[PDB]
Design a binder for this molecule. Sequence first.
Ligand code: FAD
Ligand code: FAD
Ligand code: COA
Ligand code: COA
Ligand code: ADP
Lengths: 553, 557
Amino acid sequence: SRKIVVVGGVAGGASVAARLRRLSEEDEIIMVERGEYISFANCGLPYYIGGVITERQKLLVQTVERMSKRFNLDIRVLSEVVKINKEEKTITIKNVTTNETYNEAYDVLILSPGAKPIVPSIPGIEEAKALFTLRNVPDTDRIKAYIDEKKPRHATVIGGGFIGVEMVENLRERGIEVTLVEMANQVMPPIDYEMAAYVHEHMKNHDVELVFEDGVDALEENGAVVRLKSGSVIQTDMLILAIGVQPESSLAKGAGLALGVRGTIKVNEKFQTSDPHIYAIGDAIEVKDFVTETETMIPLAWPANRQGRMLADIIHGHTDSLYKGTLGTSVAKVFDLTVATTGLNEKILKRLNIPYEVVHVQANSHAGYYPNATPVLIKLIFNKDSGKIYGAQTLGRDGVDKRMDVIATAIKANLTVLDLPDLELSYAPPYSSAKDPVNMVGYAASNIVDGFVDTVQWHEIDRIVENGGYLIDVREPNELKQGMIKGSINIPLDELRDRLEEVPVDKDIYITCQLGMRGYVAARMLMEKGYKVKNVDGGFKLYGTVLPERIVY
Amino acid sequence: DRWGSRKIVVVGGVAGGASVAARLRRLSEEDEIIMVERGEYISFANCGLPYYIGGVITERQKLLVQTVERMSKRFNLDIRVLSEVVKINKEEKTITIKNVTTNETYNEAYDVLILSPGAKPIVPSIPGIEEAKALFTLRNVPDTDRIKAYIDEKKPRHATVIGGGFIGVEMVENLRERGIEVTLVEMANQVMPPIDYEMAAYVHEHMKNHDVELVFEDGVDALEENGAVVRLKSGSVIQTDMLILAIGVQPESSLAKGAGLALGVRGTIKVNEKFQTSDPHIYAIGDAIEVKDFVTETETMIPLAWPANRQGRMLADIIHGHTDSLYKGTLGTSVAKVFDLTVATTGLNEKILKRLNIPYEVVHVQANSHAGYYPNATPVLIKLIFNKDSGKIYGAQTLGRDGVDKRMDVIATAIKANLTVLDLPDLELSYAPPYSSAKDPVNMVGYAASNIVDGFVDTVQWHEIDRIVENGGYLIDVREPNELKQGMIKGSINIPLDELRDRLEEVPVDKDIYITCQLGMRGYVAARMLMEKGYKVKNVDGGFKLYGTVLPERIVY
Ligand SMILES: Cc1cc2nc3c(=O)[nH]c(=O)nc-3n(C[C@H](O)[C@H](O)[C@H](O)COP(=O)(O)OP(=O)(O)OC[C@H]3O[C@@H](n4cnc5c(N)ncnc54)[C@H](O)[C@@H]3O)c2cc1C
Ligand SMILES: Cc1cc2nc3c(=O)[nH]c(=O)nc-3n(C[C@H](O)[C@H](O)[C@H](O)COP(=O)(O)OP(=O)(O)OC[C@H]3O[C@@H](n4cnc5c(N)ncnc54)[C@H](O)[C@@H]3O)c2cc1C
Ligand SMILES: CC(C)(COP(=O)(O)OP(=O)(O)OC[C@H]1O[C@@H](n2cnc3c(N)ncnc32)[C@H](O)[C@@H]1OP(=O)(O)O)[C@@H](O)C(=O)NCCC(=O)NCCS
Ligand SMILES: CC(C)(COP(=O)(O)OP(=O)(O)OC[C@H]1O[C@@H](n2cnc3c(N)ncnc32)[C@H](O)[C@@H]1OP(=O)(O)O)[C@@H](O)C(=O)NCCC(=O)NCCS
Ligand SMILES: Nc1ncnc2c1ncn2[C@@H]1O[C@H](COP(=O)(O)OP(=O)(O)O)[C@@H](O)[C@H]1O
């Protein structure tokens, strides 16, 4: 029989506590949470504010009474752990209502304190009456009550990451005008620039004003005026701050436990801190990314849930399966669009100086001859020699979550781009095609790995054309509606073989089509004829989405 | 070195044939590639045919993915539609082709021959079938045009579908779509042979709710009154206006037989690891060939479009000496839309594993398609079959109204990557409220299976419980008292999970304890608690929900 004390009672904390009970009836399990609720769905909060989740009670999954009863758990809400006394193996707990303190001994201590919102040093941030960050239920009730009473016409969201975007969507749907202010040149950092171009274009069609490479310089007239670094002024009725989170590691810091990147709690493969009787899981810990084993911080719910269930097994379960890192699989709903990412993106790979190739493949969510088929764009990032997958990103209106999950599975199973075409996924017209989008991205990546095709990227083509590259557009004339890449010469794929005598043999040939497929087929033709040829990855559609001001008519 | 150009002849211009031809052209401009197809159309979507009949697909031209003119131009292919290969002269290295239009026959020399002739519908020798006027099978566009013309001109009010396979079911759904009353006649005691009995029970419910009459363990004995009366083996009669036969397929291997090529199981064409038949110059792919199942490496026939397409694409590389990647065998992943319900399966089912004397365990877990607090969350049921020692996954079955395709693809991907059930909980899938839960249903079935592999819980199946109760087992129902109005298993004693720890005194130490709840989850937690207190306890896998769906006649109210 052990005494196990768990600090934090949401994702990581509730997960470990429940499994621990299932593993042993004998242990005394104490769960200490500083807020009023345990196991609340914090990820549902934006949807509650948006009125998508109409019932507040639904956000409260399990009650303290029911859970403490079901798992014979000593659950202490509104109790803030203020100090860890690691030589004494006790913690000091403070009552939130009375401020009175008391000590509680432990045999084993588990920290799952989560992460807290980052607040920047903006002049006037303390005079701001209508400034909200979103982390818990009370914060949510505050925003909800604010919107009820003051009926804001316009909201400004500061920070264009996952939280910020969901907040934008949910305020928009309530009928509130929205401006998103972002320091970077794009929304959602985990995804790459060209992918974010689709997202920006979609958010604009829903009347969100996007302000890039700008920040708040000051908050005037009580926060109602936002002065931007660019000189622009935003009149607004509320301000949502969503600029990142930092580990809640002050407890570990106070106890002299070793820290890591961004002040995360440093843990070993079994979630043990630098102290043998103290463990840590959740957003607060340093994780190694699965792909490169670089130490990082990845604050997502799936990992916090898995780490808690695993730690329960480490303490009281059978064989130790060790944590082999986080892939970082995430998904977001952006109005009608689903956006998903896994593994590393080009920006990180470039920062680490790792060589990579990428392929952009757009295919339908299901058989095109079946009603309501919609595009799915997949970007695969891989090693050109081994075919190792570094990461992937996907977006579209449907069947995005399906394809991300398949590829995420592939990466954790250590499959290469060469294995992707062999994944036998379910085919019926309503759900997929004879070759699924995932198989198709596998084929496109394999052709590059095997040397059947050479490609160039959207950010290269204009420069290549300026420097004497011969650019052939192989789209049918009817496809030329939305424009072309400057320098383009149209020779439709079906005429090309008869019109060979028109392609110069002393020049580098670049081919583009709408999505890249026919450009690939034209490339293969000309390669087998002796030409030096490269296909433009993603075709005109990607190019024109990312660089719309460069389109020629 | 490099590549010497050759003449490649492809027999069949749909799934297998089209995919091989296209890739072969991408690999070499110099090769002469001839595609011979007996129908009018190449690369049509026969998987779409039922939907065209149901009017879900409204443009016939939409079933024609590629036209002869377009494709032959794009790939510089000599495509000969309405041309039937009637004989292979393997020593002469020629084939005889009959142009069906002009009646002219000629011989075509080949260096390489690729056979992708497919599977034909089994037509049974039922008396009266010859005189049956409104009897149809479905394979190609002309069959579809005939059935559709019949519906429009003759206005049937009732249809009988003989055969409850995946294709029979699709016909049923699409006939209901047009406003036709439908009776489905199956010989087995369940629709869709790939799925197990208790999973089929859910499918039957959904079809009966859409007003389909299901007739099981009955076959058509005769077709009387010119096909307007179907007389069943039991003796019952079905008056109908039209009959659709969907009783399975058999390989189109007459050409192989005639050429003296080796045949594999069920008359399929036998091929080696490289799709080579018993003649070095003749290759074969598609529904017509014998493939190994991925899971057991048993020779079998699996007529699905994905394998055909994959095989065709692989063969093209093999022909060009790229033999690194050879065919690993088919997992047999299939998905079906049944009215509002999606049904998916992969690998081997219980019926097959018994047939092979393979020890297995199963788990049945029902979970939500996505976060429960997020609107329109619907239950998803996954049955997972595995080895209790290794954790090797033998197969999976899934059903639900949404989020079914996704889970099967993940599990199918896990199986092909050689992951055990112990790895399923470690699959980091995307979590956002509209798409999943913090632990996806796949993670969940993985945990359930891992608990069985690790010995944390012992379970009994829906088909074992009643006999165990008859033999003295003590069955405790851990649901709340209110939940019992939905019915219960004979012999059950009610002790609510929450109260159970408080009422341990009422649990006998001299009996084998069996636990049931609604879905199995609460039963498992109760099982865990009692084992820890030193009781010998087992959980009823799937709980009462499963039991009552599969054996409703046994429910005590
Ligand atoms: C609005 C919002 C939406 C999100 N949406 C998603 C999503 O869609 N998908 C996804 O994967 N992730 C999402 N996340 C992130 C996800 O919620 C976290 O990664 C996950 O909750 C981390 O779990 P945790 O146990 O580490 O921390 P938390 O779940 O934050 O739990 C930490 C708990 O410990 C308590 N605590 C901290 N210090 C003390 C102390 N000293 N004493 C007592 N208690 C203490 C806190 O009160 C808190 O309740 C979202 C987060 C937010 C804020
Ligand atoms: C109604 C229907 C629905 C289906 N739905 C699905 C589904 O949802 N999912 C799924 O995976 N599978 C489905 N299938 C099966 C799928 O269509 C087949 O597995 C696939 O087409 C088989 O590929 P194949 O190339 O072997 O044969 P086929 O596509 O049948 O092609 C064989 C071609 O060869 C021609 N041919 C044969 N002999 C000769 C000859 N001697 N000379 C010249 N030509 C010849 C035939 O006319 C035929 O066109 C369905 C089938 C049908 C009929
Ligand atoms: C729900 C919560 C309170 C408790 O978790 P839990 O008790 O593990 O409950 P779960 O449903 O996750 O696990 C179900 C258990 O039953 C098992 N199970 C489920 N269905 C089963 C079935 N049909 N048959 C047999 N076993 C089953 C699972 O294997 C698991 O047991 P194990 O972990 O001992 O193997 C906790 O996860 C929580 O706090 N959740 C919300 C936090 C969160 O995710 N937040 C992010 C914001 S949305
Ligand atoms: C369509 C059909 C002719 C296939 O021909 P195909 O030329 O292989 O056509 P696909 O669209 O599959 O093209 C995929 C090719 O383009 C490549 N590709 C696709 N998208 C690409 C992109 N964005 N960039 C670069 N290449 C791309 C793939 O890598 C692949 O080439 P590869 O095979 O040389 O690697 C054939 O599968 C068919 O007729 N299908 C319908 C018949 C059928 O399946 N019937 C059964 C019932 S549905
Ligand atoms: N001063 C600032 N003004 C505007 N945006 C900012 C500022 N500082 C950071 N950001 C942006 O806010 C976003 C933070 O999002 P992220 O790191 O995903 O955290 P979260 O998911 O909690 O929003 C990033 O896109 C980042 O570039």
